[PDB]
Amino acid sequence: AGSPVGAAGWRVDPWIFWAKWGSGPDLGWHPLLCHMLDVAAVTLQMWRRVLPAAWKARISGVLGVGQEDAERWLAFFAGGHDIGKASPAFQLQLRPEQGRELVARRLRDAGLPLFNARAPHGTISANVLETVLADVFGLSGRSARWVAFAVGGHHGFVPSYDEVRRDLDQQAVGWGMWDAAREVLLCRLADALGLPGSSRPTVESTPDAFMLAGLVSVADWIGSNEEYFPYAAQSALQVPQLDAEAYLERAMRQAERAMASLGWVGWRPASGSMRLTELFPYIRQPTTVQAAAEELAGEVKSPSITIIEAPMGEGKTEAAMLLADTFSTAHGMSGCYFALPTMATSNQMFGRVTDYLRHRYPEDVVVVNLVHGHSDLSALLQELRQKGEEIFQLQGVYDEALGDEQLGAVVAGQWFTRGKRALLPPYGVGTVDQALLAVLQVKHVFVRLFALSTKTVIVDEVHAYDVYMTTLLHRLLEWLGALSVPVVVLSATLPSARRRELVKAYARGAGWQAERDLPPAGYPRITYAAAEDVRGIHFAPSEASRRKVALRWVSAPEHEALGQLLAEALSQGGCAAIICNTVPRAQALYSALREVFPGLAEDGMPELDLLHARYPYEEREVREARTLGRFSRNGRRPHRAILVATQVIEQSLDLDFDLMVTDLAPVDLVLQRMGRLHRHPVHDPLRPERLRSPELWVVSPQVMGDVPIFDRGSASVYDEHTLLRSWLALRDRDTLQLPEDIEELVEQVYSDGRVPQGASEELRSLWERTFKAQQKVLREDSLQAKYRYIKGPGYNSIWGIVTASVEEDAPELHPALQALTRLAEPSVSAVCLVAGSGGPCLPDGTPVDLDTPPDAAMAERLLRRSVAITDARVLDPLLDVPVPKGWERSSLLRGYRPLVFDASGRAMVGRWIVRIDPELGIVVESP
Template identity: 35%
Template sequence: MAGLARLGSGLSVAARQVWAKHDRDEDDWLPLWRHLADSGAVAGLLWDEWLPAQVRDVIAAALPGGLKDARRLVVWSAATHDIGKATPAFACQVELLAEGMRKVGLEMPLRGQMDDRRLAPHGLAGMVLLHEWLMERYGWRKRSAWQWAVVAGGHHGVPPSPSDISELAARPRLLRSPGSAGAWREVQWELLDACAAACGVDERLPQWREVKLPQPVQALLTGVVIVADWIASNADLFPYARKAGDSSERERVEAAWRGLALPSPWQPAAPNVDPAELFASRFDLPLGARIRPLQERAVQVADGMAPGLMIIEGPMGEGKTEAALAVAEIFASRSGAGGVFVALPTMATSNAMFSRVLRWLLRLPDARTDAGARSVQLAHSKAALNEDFRALTWADLRATRGVQPDEDSSDGATAELVAHQWLRGRKKGMLASFGVGTIDQLLFMGLKSRHLALRHLALAGKVVIIDEAHAYDAYMNSYLDLVLSWLGAYGVPVVVLSATLPSGRRRELVEAYSGTCDADAVGDATGYPLITSAVRDGASAVHEVPASGRRTEVQVEPLDDDLELLADRLDRELAAGGCALVVRNTVDRVLQTAAYLRERLGEGNVSVAHARFLDLDRMRKDADLVERFGPPEAGGQRPDGPCVVVASQVAEQSLDIDFDLLVSDLCPVDLLLQRMGRLHRHQRGAGQSERPERLRQARCLVTGADWGAVPVEPVAGSQRVYQRSVLLRTAAVLWPHLTGATPAERSVRLPEDISPLVQSAYGPAPVGPPSWQQEMDAAHARYRVHIEKQRTKAESFRLAAVGRDGSALLGWIEAGVGEADDTPAGRAQVRDGVESLEVLVVQRLADGTVRTVPWLDGGKGGRALPTDAVPESQLGRIVAACGLRLPFQFTIPQIADQAIAELEEEVIPAWQFKDSSWLAGELILFLDENCRTRLAGYDLTYHRDDGLEATRVE
């Protein structure tokens, strides 16, 4: 910092007159040299106090001088990032400041005389100037120079493309005005020479000339420069000349850094790798519980390998999450990771995991005795509605002016965990040390979107945990494989969790991360539970794990898809009480089934659970399910009488619920096994003696298909959700059990049969009766075409693979999605499809009164909402928590367009002001007194207990 503090002292009058920033309100300005010095100083502090060692090591590995060279490079990259502002194309924007520059010999046209100045944005201009300077001053070759100069080019989020460079090359007057080109060059070179000397790179650049800067290093440098620039551009932290006072440059930077108060990264201490002691100190184990074999073996494997990729496959309820967190701690202590990110399939699973991770964090030690607060982020679009997350984000009267319009300006502080004010918002949230979020947040690392380098920087410093890996389709997996290859290139340790994976998918994950794979060992492994380990460009291995002793035999049988037949069977099975779970593949089938069963079994004995509820109602539903059907130690009130829950796929994951009997639509075998994991999940008395006698044997009735057809014919709704080929192969591998003559033949043994069933269903060998094969072959051919279409479609906005030749990141995200990463459009890109249309639901009464829906708990229901003003923050938050995803019909383009048009006609103008942060830009669905409305040709009816039902208007 000492050299940068003196950067302006030796400059010419002309160089000191070049401006970087202008405050129109205060009529104040900031000289370019000062902003460059500020940015470089901030970059140095980021390197010293904020960047995890894992990131620093990646940059250092590319340079001959290691960490010392790497720090110099980071500071110099930040100190030169805005050199493109020393050009006529930029300087002409403010006439008063431009005239000051003309007076010292830097001539330039008026702004109106430079219509093509948009072709020289200052990032591109700076990249070109740096490139010229490296070649002219230090004799660098053209190709090598681009690898280093591209960092300046990409500091506003989009690295320039070769066509951008060509357009600018044809207009040299945008860089240096004719008539004073010499003066411009002298000032540009003077500033660059001064930065090189101040940063200590003037003597290193000749040695760096032959260095190939790998693409991961270019991306990390760009990310650090973006962060440094954003901090140094904050006028509250770095005031302009008039407000700067008499403080020295060093005092100016130190005061800004204290005011920012960024939490330092986690520095994990090497944990005690005695597995039992480690788990006892980190997790709330039930009284008398012992560490499970899968958990113990995961810790042992992690302790014996270099940080890399670990895939943990094990049955439901084996504690894979706790194993992953323990492994993450071991990996981080060796790799220098400064945090952990956990990725899950949905917001609901993310919210549930967030609470668990917070409890773990409070017990997690740090190598530093003076470790301060840890920054934490819940990364999904509705994080602000999560109570645990909000508890970390206390409102603060301080407000620091940022440079990004989407950032939240409140501050947060608790004794140990904080959602830091500066690290919140759509672009910066992932920079927090610890995060839990939807898988989208990880997949965005492979989406060509603006400021992508920030997301790479954020994830390159962490251990990444990917949960429920079996839940992602081929489209999402194409993004995931690409992301894994980048994570491997950064040396990021990754832990993948799954109930079980097809052997081919396991091999793909290893190959994506490591670049190589022992195909025989990894692909042919049949043990279960199973741990697979791999390192970048190194060996992979598999480790079979003994089962924990927890096992369940589930007798399966087919049940024709007939509601009367289902009702008769449930009536008989639940005659002495008991709890049954009926899982349907579509919400429409859930509602139809529940309505029929209520008529037969009684209104109070049947409830539903699916995703088509208001957010608050969905949370209430989930809590109710865990309260009634959770583990015995939770102390919930399990129903005594007959009870049926009809649910969609929301019952497959995240909820620790336990039923006596399961009825499931035919679905992919790995998901069916997940559903079976909700059957006799916990021990209830010796030999399950606390369950009704008839239900002490676990049974699963498989329905949703015509079992008499050849081959079996799944119902139409299921084929809309899942591929026909996958459903047929599931039926085929289950056929020996479904048609078994004895209880033993009908039994699926958990966990022993999990892996064989999955490998057979997804493997290449023929399965099922011979009479099925012709139709199954045709369905599989259609499935292969579908998979290829998915992969091809994913390529549209997917990032290129990691370049291994040191080529520059020119055009890195060209033809990308712009700002649409964490938005509905962005999520649709990584999830193969149009995002479900989401609305906020309120009631509008006949007299025009608008209110929150009346049944909400805690005084939230029936609250009047103003229509001539922005609702106060508390009311706005209640409305925002009543989000609802409309049914799949509203993803059909013409219906979605019509619905949006109709909803926009109902917009309340007063709610659209920017200071209405909860409601601005949202679509509002108004229900009448009976909770009904009509939208885009559908009658919509909402019930607090059943959710939304949509009926096409004839």
């Protein structure tokens, strides 16, 4: 520091600097030191009221200090996140319309030099902390640099090394008097936290600092809510006179109230030492997999991965929740995230999770988990309808890459509105995609790693096709292993190579130097892996799982006779499902099937029904509720019904069907679809005699010679070569011998064996060609990994864990990078409206003002019309439609495109016609 500073300069007065500033009705402002005390207070309350004890113990172990020192120091860093706001570049950012000259004269009175240079405040925070944390606070240079970059990454991305130590203007950061000012602020915040003269923490572990950045981001978000953290200054004209400690106390109580509103407090484990029959009253005699799980439960270690492989319908989820209960009770990991399969809704799972949660936690589960632990939109809607202003609302989030403070407040505020919100609460149910996003190079990934770090992860239903086609779960397992996160993976069946690479990934993250191989065990089995311990527990399949399943084919010439086949099969009655690989095929087959089954069912709704994601959300709620009401284990089963549907039935849902028709798919997916066939024994006596023998109809592809010709939709959804392997594995079967044939088929298709089996040359050509295509895809993804995936845990530099496109912002996320990695289909969110005078209107029938943000009621009614279009034909033209100016400033409606149908229910989008059918849902069609 090259500028001498006199005592008059050291008088400074800390309170003059601002961190938050008002706009309209709020003429006041928030002093920077107040904001730092607020974020530190939120960190303290997190440590004392939210975080699981195992997390605090482990982080205290990494820090090398006791839990008290770890608490005050983490609070010090998190409060130190905005230290760079004390720079000329940020203080002069103020709007001229809102008293910028007043702040200018106020700084000038202190004697601070002024400069017009501009830099993001977080990079400045890294630039100052990397030196100040060492030269004053006595931390090692590595810990200082690590805390500096991590804390400086809080608005989206950790700064690149050049951003902090090369391109950064000195005039932007300031020096001399500014350094004395920041030194004063940091010393006062530290004294308020009681840092002297406690032993200095070691922060040299890269992954830990990385997730800690996510903790800091969440803390700043909590401090950004003006309802719980009102600005201390009542007007720009005057600087408040404050005692830092009393303000810290008030900030702590406010933090407690704010986090209490989010339902993070207070999940007391309330042990306890419960058995499986107690947690789940509905089960009398536990299934064999649950028995082996109950036996394993007494021997589990704090960080370990479990892989459960049992036939579908055997009740693996209760075993997973059992191990999770053992983790929360006996190992201090009181939190869990239930990672659902991508096509699954959270609804049915959430009730099971709630029913388990009643046995371990007080009735706060009613007042907390019901609205906060749910990922899907219905909970957000009920939270909107409920009094009062239940949704968390941010303001004054100064993300430089967005155009203004409130815009950044909206983008950050999406974390409390979008499905990713389910990640935040200690118990949450949601898609596996939210957890898989943690390894992508996207905004705020460290927030995801931080959320996952505090909970055991339970991956419900893993498919072999997914683990074969992508590395996402492997990388997530590496980072999960680094964070000492317990993991349970449910699966109907996996190839041995897949289990090997998964356990290898979690072990690689764990740092487990032991290289001993996984013990062999017959199917069904439970793999297990702790530090010093590794197990392969085989167990006898339940006798109910021993069934022969008929496998009939319907060839393309017979395909139009398929409805007549449904007539001859269901003539005696009985439920039946028909899975389709794509929405348009489902709509078409349904339209064809309407002629065959006109009749109403006993429940007063038609026996024929359709289900897919492409509906306005309320209609989706109706059809989903009707389906779950018909075909669940306890539902009012119709004497006869037919349900055409996509793969939304294929995953997670607890449905039962007397008969199953399905499109060709990779075999693990077909079996997963087949798990809904005769799933519940209680339904056995009442089944029609024609359907008493389980039977699985598969839709055959057109076959020129011996060469299959897959339909374009399935070809676009699934890898073509895998479909070829599956069709070859299934084409000669007459009967499936469960449960061994499950593992047999899956280990046949995904394993090394090439079986042309002496067929035609053209088929060999199709084989080699489709395989070359698949390998070209996998290779191309492997070569683009630097631009897509974050560095693994063993990477040494805290910077460069995420490189480009840093601070865009905010880069996709779901529409873009999600698609290149095939994590999910790219899509547009849309709001179905109707045309009329005065612009777009709701169907019933009130006008919408697109120019202003919606009120919560109107936002709810608008969200009820929402739909996630994913069709390639109209996706781009829909993106070209601007998001209306009032919506992008709303966290509830950012990224949503209005979709104005006419009275005919038609709308002109691109060359294509979009139409909103009462039965078919949204329908794309050529004009």
